[PDB]
Amino acid sequence: KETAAAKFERQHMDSSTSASSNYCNQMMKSRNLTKDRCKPVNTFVHESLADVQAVCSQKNVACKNGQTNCYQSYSTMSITDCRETGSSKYPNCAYKTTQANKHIIVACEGNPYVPVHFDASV
Incomplete structure (x- = not known):
């Protein structure tokens, strides 16, 4: 089974790039x-x-779902938000690529204690 930790790295990690319009x-x-x-x-x-x-x-904060296992980065991080376009139709999924520098909020669980969900950026 894909573990929640591995799923987080697949969905949310892209260290290879520091910050194109095609990227998303x-x-x-x-x-x-x-x-x-x-x-x-x-x-x-x-x-x-x-x-x-x-x-x-780092900083323990409430998760959007009301769980207590979320953490906010003390420093800002380089992120890219992907947001589906109005006109995007499965299977031809289309996204707007937006770069930002924000604090991330992730949910953590397990032993080792690692990120399993991306909750927000602030």
Whole structure:
């Protein structure tokens, strides 16, 4: 079974790139986020895996779902938000690529204590 930790790295990690207009169209497809449907919104983090994992030891904040296992990065991180276009129709999923530098909020669980969900950017 794909583990929640591995699923987080597939959905949300892209250390290879520091911060193109095609990027979300390419990445949402290559990371298998358009296989069953167009995933409507998704964020990629352009930091090292160790720096993102380290967020699980940073500022504890409420998750949007009311769970207590979310963490906010003390430093800003390079991210890309992918947002499905009005005109996008499965299977030809189309996205708007937006670069930002924001604090990330991730949910962490397990032993080792690692990110399993991307909750928000602020």
